[PDB]
Design a protein around this ligand. Sequence first.
Ligand SMILES: *[C@@H]1O[C@H](CO)[C@@H](O)[C@H](O)[C@H]1NC(C)=O
Lengths: 202, 51, 151, 51
Amino acid sequence: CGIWVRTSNGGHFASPNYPDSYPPNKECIYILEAAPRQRIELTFDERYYIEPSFECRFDHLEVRDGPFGFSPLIDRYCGMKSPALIRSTGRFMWIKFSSDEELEGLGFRAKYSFICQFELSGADGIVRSSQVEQEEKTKPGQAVDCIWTIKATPKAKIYLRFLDYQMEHSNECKRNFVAVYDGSSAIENLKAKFCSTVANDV
Amino acid sequence: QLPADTKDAKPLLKEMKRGKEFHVIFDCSHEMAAGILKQALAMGMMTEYYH
Amino acid sequence: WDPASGLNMTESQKGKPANITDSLSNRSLIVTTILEEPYVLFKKSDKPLYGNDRFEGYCIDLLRELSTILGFTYEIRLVEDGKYGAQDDVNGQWNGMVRELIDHKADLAVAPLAITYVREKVIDFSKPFMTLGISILYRKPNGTNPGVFSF
Amino acid sequence: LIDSKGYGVGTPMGSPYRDKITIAILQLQEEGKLHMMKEKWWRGNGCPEEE
Ligand SMILES: *[C@@H]1O[C@H](CO)[C@@H](O)[C@H](O)[C@H]1NC(C)=O
């Protein structure tokens, strides 16, 4: 499903097999990345203009601003109506399209226009703790948070082991916590979040 | 209630299969009955479980 | 009610918030302790703990026995800063647990607490549950005989 | 010491002397004078007959 649309002033973004009905059982990610100081304007072209009398799940196109996952929910679109054009300066509109086990529709057509995350992949390695004074030097005073992206070798599931874990600042986590996400980086599925003395391997 | 227009029970029948609703009564001019049985079969509802 | 908004029922916030002076209640008790090692420590887990269960200690299940046999409520409120309650002469203050043994911000404070001369002047202490004292710490000898003359 | 136990000063359930005598006992403990009286009563005849 992946159509890497990175680094375009504008470009085509659409559901798979667009002029046909989208395939079933498809949970494929899309990501829109904007260079610093830019603005993202997402143009969305509906294929079919009717007014539904209901809103339902099982086929939903939501929009997220920021680290997919952390990104606060913007809205969750479905049906056959054209969503209104979204203008934000969050610089990261990352959008996921889902699929149920049946009941495909006319799909969708869209158009993107343009006006703390460090890559860490390979076969093995270590995420340096609080390694923030080199990547994105953030002053200690404010709350800080960062995400880390792993990519194993092709055909390789991954196992993690924590070598040192101590979040002094609480037992609870309303301020500070460490969590792991499986699949791709969304709020879809917390593999686990760690708030206590010990952090188990995963 | 069947949607008044579009004769499209795909939303409706999906709702039905969600609840595992293994019994149905109908009420319709038999044209709709035929036109909806084909829908049911296409949705795969046609299994010996439903009566 | 309107088609748009719905029921603006004026009871959603009651005009007269119901209040009863005397009803069923428990008299909760505040204790003050410290993170001393084989006494009171955070319980070991990975999932978050909440309330009194975040802790563990020989002292804490001792208080468990106490409340079991007499009946109380657990407000394990830790001291602000690590300190045996010990007064200061200059400040005249009693920084540490003695504050809570004085200011009635808290109650009986079960923790390593030597019932000393000055403390009973300002606080009341039950009879000690276990005695103490001073001994010497040493590394036991090893089979490295001098062997100049090991004959 | 298989078990630990001490002694006390018996006072009636109402006694103005309990707290003050507790204070004095603790203070004497600080000077350890009660230790010296014990030793005169124990250690004095403790080891004048070290075999
Ligand atoms: C509810 O009633 C109050 C008082 O008339 C009014 O100020 C408020 O706007 C009303 N709200 C709605 C939801 O109509």
